[PDB]
Amino acid sequence: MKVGIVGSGMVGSATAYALALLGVAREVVLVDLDRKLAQAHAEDILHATPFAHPVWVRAGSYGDLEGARAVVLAAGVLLDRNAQVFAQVVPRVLEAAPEAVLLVATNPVDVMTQVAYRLSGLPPGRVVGSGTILDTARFRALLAEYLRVAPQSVHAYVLGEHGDSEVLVWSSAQVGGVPLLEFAEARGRALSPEDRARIDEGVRRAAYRIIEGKGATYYGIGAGLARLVRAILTDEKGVYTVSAFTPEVEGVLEVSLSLPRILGAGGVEGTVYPSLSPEEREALRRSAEILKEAAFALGF
Amino acid sequence: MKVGIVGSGMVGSATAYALALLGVAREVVLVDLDRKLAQAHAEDILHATPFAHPVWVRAGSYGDLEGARAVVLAAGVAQRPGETRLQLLDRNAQVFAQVVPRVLEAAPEAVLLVATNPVDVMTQVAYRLSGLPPGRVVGSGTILDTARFRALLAEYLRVAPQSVHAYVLGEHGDSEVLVWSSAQVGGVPLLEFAEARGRALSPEDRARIDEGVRRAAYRIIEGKGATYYGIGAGLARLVRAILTDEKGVYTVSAFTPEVEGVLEVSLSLPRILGAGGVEGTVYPSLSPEEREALRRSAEILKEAAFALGF
Amino acid sequence: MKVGIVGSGMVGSATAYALALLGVAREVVLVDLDRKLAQAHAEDILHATPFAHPVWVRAGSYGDLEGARAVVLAAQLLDRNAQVFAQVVPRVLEAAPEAVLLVATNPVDVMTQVAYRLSGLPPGRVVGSGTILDTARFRALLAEYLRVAPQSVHAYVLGEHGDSEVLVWSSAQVGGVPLLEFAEARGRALSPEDRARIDEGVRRAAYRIIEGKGATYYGIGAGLARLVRAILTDEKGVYTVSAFTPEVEGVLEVSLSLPRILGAGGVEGTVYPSLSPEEREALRRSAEILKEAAFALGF
Amino acid sequence: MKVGIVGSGMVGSATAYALALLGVAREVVLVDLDRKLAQAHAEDILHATPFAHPVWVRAGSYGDLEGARAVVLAAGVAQRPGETRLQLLDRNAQVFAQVVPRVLEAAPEAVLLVATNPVDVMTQVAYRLSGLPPGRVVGSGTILDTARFRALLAEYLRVAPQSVHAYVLGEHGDSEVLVWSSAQVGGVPLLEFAEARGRALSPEDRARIDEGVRRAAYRIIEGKGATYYGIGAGLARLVRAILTDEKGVYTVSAFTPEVEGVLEVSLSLPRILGAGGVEGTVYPSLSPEEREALRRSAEILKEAAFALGF
Ligand SMILES: NC(=O)c1ccc[n+]([C@@H]2O[C@H](COP(=O)([O-])OP(=O)(O)OC[C@H]3O[C@@H](n4cnc5c(N)ncnc54)[C@H](O)[C@@H]3O)[C@@H](O)[C@H]2O)c1
Numbered sequence A: 001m002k003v004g005i006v007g008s009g010m011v012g013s014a015t016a017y018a019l020a021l022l023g024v025a026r027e028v029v030l031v032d033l034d035r036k037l038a039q040a041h042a043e044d045i046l047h048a049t050p051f052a053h054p055v056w057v058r059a060g061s062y063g064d065l066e067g068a069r070a071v072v073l074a075a076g077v078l079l080d081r082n083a084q085v086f087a088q089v090v091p092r093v094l095e096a097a098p099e100a101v102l103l104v105a106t107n108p109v110d111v112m113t114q115v116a117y118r119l120s121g122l123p124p125g126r127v128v129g130s131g132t133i134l135d136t137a138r139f140r141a142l143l144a145e146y147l148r149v150a151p152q153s154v155h156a157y158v159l160g161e162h163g164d165s166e167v168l169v170w171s172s173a174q175v176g177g178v179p180l181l182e183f184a185e186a187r188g189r190a191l192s193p194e195d196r197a198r199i200d201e202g203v204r205r206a207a208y209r210i211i212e213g214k215g216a217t218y219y220g221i222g223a224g225l226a227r228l229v230r231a232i233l234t235d236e237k238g239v240y241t242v243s244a245f246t247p248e249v250e251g252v253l254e255v256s257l258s259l260p261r262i263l264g265a266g267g268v269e270g271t272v273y274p275s276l277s278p279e280e281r282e283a284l285r286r287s288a289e290i291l292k293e294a295a296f297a298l299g300f
Numbered sequence B, D: 001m002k003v004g005i006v007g008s009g010m011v012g013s014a015t016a017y018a019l020a021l022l023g024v025a026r027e028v029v030l031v032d033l034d035r036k037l038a039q040a041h042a043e044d045i046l047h048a049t050p051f052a053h054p055v056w057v058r059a060g061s062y063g064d065l066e067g068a069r070a071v072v073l074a075a076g077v078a079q080r081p082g083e084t085r086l087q088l089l090d091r092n093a094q095v096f097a098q099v100v101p102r103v104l105e106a107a108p109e110a111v112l113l114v115a116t117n118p119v120d121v122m123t124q125v126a127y128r129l130s131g132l133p134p135g136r137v138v139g140s141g142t143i144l145d146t147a148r149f150r151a152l153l154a155e156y157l158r159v160a161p162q163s164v165h166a167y168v169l170g171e172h173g174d175s176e177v178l179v180w181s182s183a184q185v186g187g188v189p190l191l192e193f194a195e196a197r198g199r200a201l202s203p204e205d206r207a208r209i210d211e212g213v214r215r216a217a218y219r220i221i222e223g224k225g226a227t228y229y230g231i232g233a234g235l236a237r238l239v240r241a242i243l244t245d246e247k248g249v250y251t252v253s254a255f256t257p258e259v260e261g262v263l264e265v266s267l268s269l270p271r272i273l274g275a276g277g278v279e280g281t282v283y284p285s286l287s288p289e290e291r292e293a294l295r296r297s298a299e300i301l302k303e304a305a306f307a308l309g310f
Numbered sequence C: 001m002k003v004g005i006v007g008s009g010m011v012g013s014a015t016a017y018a019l020a021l022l023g024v025a026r027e028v029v030l031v032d033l034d035r036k037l038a039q040a041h042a043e044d045i046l047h048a049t050p051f052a053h054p055v056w057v058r059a060g061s062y063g064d065l066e067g068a069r070a071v072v073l074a075a076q077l078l079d080r081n082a083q084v085f086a087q088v089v090p091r092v093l094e095a096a097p098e099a100v101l102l103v104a105t106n107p108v109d110v111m112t113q114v115a116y117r118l119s120g121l122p123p124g125r126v127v128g129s130g131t132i133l134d135t136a137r138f139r140a141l142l143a144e145y146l147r148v149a150p151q152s153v154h155a156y157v158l159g160e161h162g163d164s165e166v167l168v169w170s171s172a173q174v175g176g177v178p179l180l181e182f183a184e185a186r187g188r189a190l191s192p193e194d195r196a197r198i199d200e201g202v203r204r205a206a207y208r209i210i211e212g213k214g215a216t217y218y219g220i221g222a223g224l225a226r227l228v229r230a231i232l233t234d235e236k237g238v239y240t241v242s243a244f245t246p247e248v249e250g251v252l253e254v255s256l257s258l259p260r261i262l263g264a265g266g267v268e269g270t271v272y273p274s275l276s277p278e279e280r281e282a283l284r285r286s287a288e289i290l291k292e293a294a295f296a297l298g299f
């Protein structure tokens, strides 16, 4: 299988790097306006492959994306300029890779997924935004540290906007099949309001802290996008909190935000409107209205 | 790191094979009364390794378990058609009276991981005989029933079992407890998720699923004489959790002070697995019906063990 | 993608298990005249999947092999086996015409030739495990002997999977060095007696294992799974496998093992390595035996 | 187990990232003069772990290196566009003067894996300062050049690089030696295989490949400013080799008693990697031309070290 990445900056190349080491696809093609940059990243990642799996890593143009099952959109130059980028990029991608699933990372990722969606003319399940997939992973990693258990055992969700209005879903969170409060107690911890506030801050301000420390985030999302690409290429039928055009959510219509969804060869194949407290559900409504306004004020 | 396997039969060898293919340990030592059989299995599996990971697979004596971080106990008789797991108990208790001493002599720091049926009572047996802290003697328990529950639900709803969160508690046997009350997919109550998904689970459908899990070993035994691929993978995964100090959460068996009022009994509850074996236990909130079934399961295990002075 | 396995015995089930644990294919279909046996293995292996990778394991009929890109064939004995392939091969291909056929049934070289003649496929799309297991054994034994990971031992076996197989000592290397000096100091130089022990270890391996446990399946299971992975990922990796070969040391139209490139098309290329006079004569004799065995049976 | 990385720059962070995605160790500690930098990289990589493997990734002081089984030294300046690796020597020897003793306070039993360029001289600087046995101070050396040679030969032949067994020896830099003479593909001599594949490997083809290999770093730095993905995977693989006691064979750099007549010089040869670091060295099969090139390469490294008194 062949995967494409348009926008070979830090996010795109980190994604290419994860795909290569984890052997997700037999072939990865990086596309970037800066052609020497794509080539440099491609060569560097190609050179990792003898340590891991056979992957034909290379740089190319949209034409080289032919037959790609998935193409990751991580291109950026504001929402004004970014939206103009996607106007250029999307139709060129689909020209070459008609049946590819689009995976959007470019921020603000919710609004950009909707732009990608309006431009593509494909079923909404075919245009997938990374959405809160990274926030969910952050929430899990932070509960993991707090509980000192493997994040792979923590099953917690972040929904709504990949941004400031995102909703941490505490009510239905579970660890190893056990409700979060009661697992925490067994572990010797109380999840006090103070503990919660601290974990909330940890997730909500995560990107800010990393940016101020090293200028950008890319390792986290690189891995999350590689994982979604894998979900798509293997027709995994796995559940992830990703963003996609949603007919309706809490009364808000035709908006893209993250809910738990089933990912497979067709992209999003199912959406779960899950179980939230009144507090969380209202937070999700407020989040959905934030994203709605933002997209309309741009015509998408 | 070295892993020991005692009993190089179907279960033992399938576990060693999973360990090899997954590169879990750098060295796997197979120990069997029948040295030629362990030797043949070790050769056969050694020959897989050039296709996977570097693993020194070999057959050995009990002295060769030395320095093992975990030892899997898979020696002893399996149930034949018509027979329950609890019926193996007298015979396999006698085996463990031979096995456990010899293991702790060669590898006194090893975490014991028990597979031999009936696995909950055998874990208790091993615990009594070993003199070890309860955390260090772990039975596979319902880890396989939980896997079976998730897989049948996965097949039902056509989603990856990885995304299905449901588990089984109590006895690894006829009295096990499917915990429907807290099962979720995508943060949603399982029954709600299924309806939404347009394949709802009626009472009848659940009954069929309960049977799918409950009678899986009997079906498999009748069709091919034994079960071993599923438990082999499950054992390799627990060995991995221990050797990597994973702090993962699994439904496994261990000696438990008190559960629904029944005292000093080994059965499966959600537990945290790491370098020291079981490092913590959760006693989940259950529906009244599940709580009662779990009590019943525990009294059964307690009785069976007591009758032998365990 | 989908892999099919015809013959769900020890070898077929062990292959399916390896495929499942390694997450090689998304769907694995087990087919066997003994319907309950295939079902049983399918359930047993399905239950492993939550520990590893999502894989739809199930038992079925030929119609279920549909869309398979690889199908493993692991179903006077020689006469009865040939006859199995006469029943099985047509049906597999009917249901999965684009499937590469991977043959495990013994004697694997003759059965590969049998499968080839019956299938009417390009020669590259009918591949026998051949000496792939013999090569892994040669490497594993050299690995134990030198105490280095077998992955750093590149040494192979050519010819018949069986008594006439040829260990290619002449070009064996470990870290770009010739085996013999590499050992001579790793501190243990490989006498002619040591090479003889190793030869026996490889050549008699199946005998020792069958005597000890009645059958071999783990080694071949892993090897087949690996070949299935090469095929499905279009790996273009090099393996010593068996396939219909126009000419070898003068012998014509015989199936035996040589170094070959493996990809989506099955055997996509074949290397005819230079060998010592010893090895060359051995390979010829090996080819001669297989040609004769095939001819007698009418293939 | 625990791995330390000193220098949380592009190379150190990409190495940690590879370790986390491949699940090589249970804990990874990033140490850097710029603490906010290590912290940002550590958070960023921790957040990847739910998608892959459990790994406690964190930033820390030298003190937090305690108990590390290996410590990767990736601290110091990298090449500017057009700058050669040897031009970094004096600046990075001074960095190592600070780093090496501070690592060995916290983790005197750690195997050291040196990435900082010029990696051969830096390996020899680490060796002198550490007071460790030669085998325990490992430089990545030509491990990445070997990979480039394999990857470019793989493109040339259209086979998986995993099937190409060709290596690069000597300096990790302009004077490195491509060992064409003994190169094989899947057990077969390279010339023999190239022809079977429809390739005659002309002198032009060899020149092209040599340049592809020799100048890879210059090209990548010009295009994106630095290299880190290739070496990150290479370092992770070496860390894995050490932590698992692999006994794998790799071309890495270590202090070498005598090479082609040149004495007491650190440079890349095929070596066996295990828990002790380098547990064996092979002086390989070379043509007269290759041999002379290795001697010249060793001489450049010898004089560079000696001028600094190392
Ligand atoms: N969780 C998430 O969804 C998440 C997390 C982090 C960053 N992001 C983001 O994703 C994007 C990338 O981040 P980044 O740091 O890599 O930025 P980056 O600038 O480093 O890389 C961006 C690039 O896209 C390339 N590019 C721009 N326009 C292009 C076009 N029209 N065609 C081809 N290529 C084009 C640019 O040349 C450049 O290399 C941003 O929008 C950043 O905010 C998203």
Ligand SMILES: NC(=O)c1ccc[n+]([C@@H]2O[C@H](COP(=O)([O-])OP(=O)(O)OC[C@H]3O[C@@H](n4cnc5c(N)ncnc54)[C@H](O)[C@@H]3O)[C@@H](O)[C@H]2O)c1
Binding pocket: B006, B007, B008, B009, B010, B011, B012, B031, B032, B033, B034, B037, B074, B075, B076, B077, B078, B079, B088, B092, B095, B098, B099, B114, B115, B116, B117, B118, B119, B140, B141, B144, B172, B226, B227, B228, B231
């Ligand atoms: N879920 C589970 O916990 C689970 C699942 C399947 C099977 N099992 C149990 O596993 C046991 C083994 O099953 P099996 O199929 O592998 O049987 P097996 O007979 O095939 O193999 C068992 C073996 O143990 C060996 N052995 C016996 N006593 C020994 C001793 N003192 N020291 C060394 N080796 C000894 C025997 O020689 C034999 O090879 C049974 O109790 C079976 O019911 C448990």
Ligand SMILES: NC(=O)c1ccc[n+]([C@@H]2O[C@H](COP(=O)([O-])OP(=O)(O)OC[C@H]3O[C@@H](n4cnc5c(N)ncnc54)[C@H](O)[C@@H]3O)[C@@H](O)[C@H]2O)c1
Binding pocket: C006, C007, C008, C009, C010, C011, C012, C031, C032, C033, C034, C037, C074, C075, C084, C087, C088, C104, C105, C106, C108, C129, C130, C133, C161, C215, C216, C217, C220
């Ligand atoms: N390296 C090698 O190439 C290697 C190594 C080991 C075994 N083998 C060969 O593997 C083989 C199969 O071995 P095994 O151990 O699994 O034996 P096995 O008997 O256990 O299984 C073989 C099976 O084929 C099934 N089968 C037979 N005829 C069938 C038909 N026409 N349609 C579908 N299914 C049918 C049988 O029911 C049975 O289950 C033997 O030929 C064996 O010698 C090869």
Ligand SMILES: NC(=O)c1ccc[n+]([C@@H]2O[C@H](COP(=O)([O-])OP(=O)(O)OC[C@H]3O[C@@H](n4cnc5c(N)ncnc54)[C@H](O)[C@@H]3O)[C@@H](O)[C@H]2O)c1
Binding pocket: D006, D007, D008, D009, D010, D011, D012, D031, D032, D033, D034, D037, D074, D075, D076, D077, D078, D079, D088, D092, D095, D098, D099, D114, D115, D116, D117, D118, D119, D140, D141, D144, D172, D226, D227, D228, D231
């Ligand atoms: N194959 C190879 O051997 C290879 C390949 C590529 C790069 N490298 C190299 O490795 C080094 C790093 O490259 P880079 O790109 O990461 O550079 P970088 O500048 O991005 O990161 C280097 C860092 O070292 C940290 N550091 C410096 N001195 C320190 C000290 N006393 N203690 C703790 N931390 C300290 C610095 O703060 C900085 O973060 C260079 O020498 C570069 O050439 C080697």
